[PDB]
Design a protein around this ligand. Structure first.
Ligand code: NAG
Lengths: 176, 187
């Protein structure tokens, strides 16, 4: 019985819902590459709708996000929505909001997408956990409580975030 | 346009339409204060609609913006729209986009607001220029006749963007003199 612990950014500050963070990797160079909003393949969607991370961190920085906790603050092991915190055209507002996709028969998993909703019964909820001595992991939780770890599959040469069983993605939160 | 000059951020790097910048003050201390999206008192907008700067740089950092040229890249003396680069609800998307308000007969000028459009005939276009030899200034540049604008004189009827004190807050606004001197810090 430990009690709720705050998530901390790379500066050691508690995550604030009114701030923006890049989700960066544990690794540097070739193992680096921040999370970003990109275009998927075989995607009907009118807007960018894939959640990816870069193939190395020697290039662009990630797309910032905010965390919308269901009730109150950003704490470990607590449900929240995640949304890329940038301006889009009216059409694409939905497509900043993280969502888990339909089970993809080739990968035999669900890939992370955008196009969901904030704070509803149909929304995709995630939690931030410390499964490790350094950094955090993201889990997807429907409706401990039957969650799934987020990691990466390789899709058209890109790092596509997806649900996995082993090697989840280790991340830190870098205030923007 | 004696060869076209890209606008540079605080690292000397050319500004890009797909990055975000904070608009920061140039002076530090009490002269400091980044641009932010704030709630206007005396506005019935359904979302915050005021372009302000903080009263010193000890407070929060500014609301990031992106620059959206009418055409092409980001260059000095070239028309662009400006938008605070943040997620909002659908009804509030407009209120990330910079525009010039109507004549405020009390301040005897127009206040900078959000509520605008991007890349249309009705959009509020601005330019990034170099008046003083350190940092940049913003101008508002009417693309139709500014019947209503007191300070739309300069050259092409462009007006200097500066600051007025509204409920003890620095509110951006068209000024006759003392333009706001700004640097762009990549987010
Ligand atoms: C910004 O926009 C260009 C437009 O083609 C795109 O290739 C790129 O992702 C971005 N980066 C740079 C450095 O231009």
């Amino acid at each position: 019985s430990p009690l709720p612990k705050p998530v901390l950014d790379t500066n050691g500050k508690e995550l604030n819902p009114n701030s923006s963070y890049r989700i960066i990797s544990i690794g540097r160079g070739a193992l680096g590459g921040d999370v970003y909003l990109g275009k998927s393949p075989n995607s009907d969607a009118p807007c960018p709708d894939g959640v990816f991370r870069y193939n190395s961190d020697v290039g662009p920085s990630g797309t910032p996000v905010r965390f919308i906790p269901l009730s109150g603050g950003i704490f470990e092991d607590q449900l929240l929505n995640i949304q890329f915190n940038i301006a889009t055209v009216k059409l694409c507002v939905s497509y900043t909001i993280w969502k888990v996709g339909n089970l993809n028969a080739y990968f035999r998993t669900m890939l992370l997408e955008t196009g969901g909703t904030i704070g509803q019964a149909d929304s995709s909820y995630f939690k931030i956990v410390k499964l490790s001595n350094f950094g955090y992991n993201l889990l997807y939780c429907p409706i401990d409580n039957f969650c799934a770890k987020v990691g990466v599959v390789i899709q058209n040469g890109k790092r596509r975030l997806a649900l996995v069983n082993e090697n989840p993605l280790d991340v830190l939160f870098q205030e923007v």
